[PDB]
Paper text:
Src homology 2 domain-containing inositol phosphate phosphatase 2 (SHIP2) is one of the 10 human inositol phosphate 5-phosphatases. One of its physiological functions is dephosphorylation of phosphatidylinositol 3,4,5-trisphosphate, PtdIns(3,4,5)P3. It is therefore a therapeutic target for pathophysiologies dependent on PtdIns(3,4,5)P3 and PtdIns(3,4)P2. Therapeutic interventions are limited by the dearth of crystallographic data describing ligand/inhibitor binding.
Finally, using a structural biology approach, we solve the structure of a SHIP2 catalytic domain in complex with a bound dimeric ligand and potent inhibitor. The related compound, 5,5′-ethane-1,2-diylbis(oxy)bis(benzene-1,2,4-trisphosphate)20 (5) (hereafter named 1,2,4-dimer), is a bridged dimer of the surrogate ligand of IP3Rs, benzene 1,2,4-trisphosphate. The crystal structure of the 1,2,4-dimer-SHIP2cd complex comprises two monomers of SHIP2 and a single copy of the inhibitor in the asymmetric unit. The 1,2,4-dimer does not occupy the positions of the crystallographically resolved ligands or of the predicted bound states of docked ligands in catalytic domain or multidomain structures. Indeed, the 1,2,4-dimer ligand fails to directly contact the L4 loop. Remarkably, we observe that phosphate P4 of 1,2,4-dimer interacts with D613. This, we suggest, precludes interaction of this residue with R682 and adoption of the L4-out conformation that, in its transient motions, accompanies optimal catalysis. While the distal binding of 1,2,4-dimer does not significantly modify the L4 closed (L4-in) conformation from that seen in the complex with BiPh(2,3′,4,5′,6)P5 (1), the compound is a potent displacer of 2-FAM-InsP5 and a potent inhibitor of 5-phosphatase activity against Ins(1,3,4,5)P4. Thus, 1,2,4-dimer meets both the kinetic and structural criteria of an uncompetitive allosteric inhibitor of SHIP2. One intriguing possibility is that a previously unrecognized substrate or product is evident in the 1,2,4-dimer (5)-liganded structure.
Author numbering: 423 to 533, 540 to 584, 599 to 674, 684 to 698, 702 to 728
The structure:
């Protein structure tokens, strides 16, 4: 058993705040990490960002530096692939570099919007992580599905994790969306999330799992706070994490609410994998 943290954050083309620990520790809204397990530094940290204005060299240092402050360890980068403002990085608890083997990165571009990928071996178990940024727009669902198909075809596993700004929107007008959000009734909204719909229609992410979403749409917020959406773009769960395990436990899945540099909130996910 190992702990694989996964984070996806569309940073709205603006640098991050110097402290994003609530992202690392799965603190905020949704299925957050309990008061005890948060103190257990995870074995692998995967950081997927879109519209990331920071440079590859420095962004990795911000990540590796932030991890040391939290864990008191010097996590070891395994791979880091970037495609314009789309960047992904993988770090590992230093006491497990010998376990890693056959590290591989890849990329695919559609349009910037695309997908960066990383895969490696941990003991006799292989992993794959895909950080994407699909076509935006309320009425471009077929485009997003086709973007997913290209990535699934143009990329170069025992456990496969697909995350990023999938950009799927809600099929409901703003009046009812805000009404349901104010009551924290997300199920009526989730029933009309395009990603759920496209999965339930067996059109994309076939046999992919996603943890129950119990946090509010991560988009689109006004920069500076979380108590308000900038819907003039209906709120939507643009930023998602799905997995497909060979014939996995999800100890958390949510978003922060104290990181307010972007119009997206950071989304996190932690898993215990074999």
């Amino acid at each position: 058993m190992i702990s694989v943290f996964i984070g996806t954050w569309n940073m709205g083309s603006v640098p991050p705040p110097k402290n994003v620990t609530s992202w690392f520790t799965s603190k905020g809204l949704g299925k957050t990490l309990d008061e005890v397990t948060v103190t257990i530094p995870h074995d692998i940290y995967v950081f997927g960002t879109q519209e990331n204005s920071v440079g590859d060299r420095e962004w990795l240092d911000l990540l590796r530096g932030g991890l040391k402050e939290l864990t008191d360890l010097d996590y070891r980068p395994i791979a880091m692939q970037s495609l314009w403002n789309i960047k992904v990085a993988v770090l590992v608890k230093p006491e497990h570099e010998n376990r890693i083997s056959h590290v591989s990165t890849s990329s695919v571009k559609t349009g910037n919007k695309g997908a960066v990928g990383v895969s490696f071996m941990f003991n006799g178990t292989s992993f794959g992580f895909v950080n994407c940024h699909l076509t935006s727009g309320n009425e471009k669902t077929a485009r997003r599905n086709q973007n997913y198909l290209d990535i699934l075809r143009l990329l170069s596993f025992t456990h496969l994790f697909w995350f990023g700004d999938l950009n799927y929107r809600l099929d409901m007008d703003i009046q009812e969306i805000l009404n349901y959000i104010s009551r924290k009734e997300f199920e009526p909204l989730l029933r009309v999330d395009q990603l759920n719909l496209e999965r339930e229609k067996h059109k994309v992410f076939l046999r992919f799992s996603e943890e129950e979403i119990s946090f509010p749409p991560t988009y689109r917020y006004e920069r500076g706070s979380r108590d308000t959406y900038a819907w003039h773009n209906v709120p939507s769960w643009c930023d998602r994490i799905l997995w497909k395990s060979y014939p996995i436990i999800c100890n958390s899945y949510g978003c922060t609410d104290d990181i307010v540099t972007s119009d997206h909130s950071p989304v996190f996910g932690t898993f215990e994998v074999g």
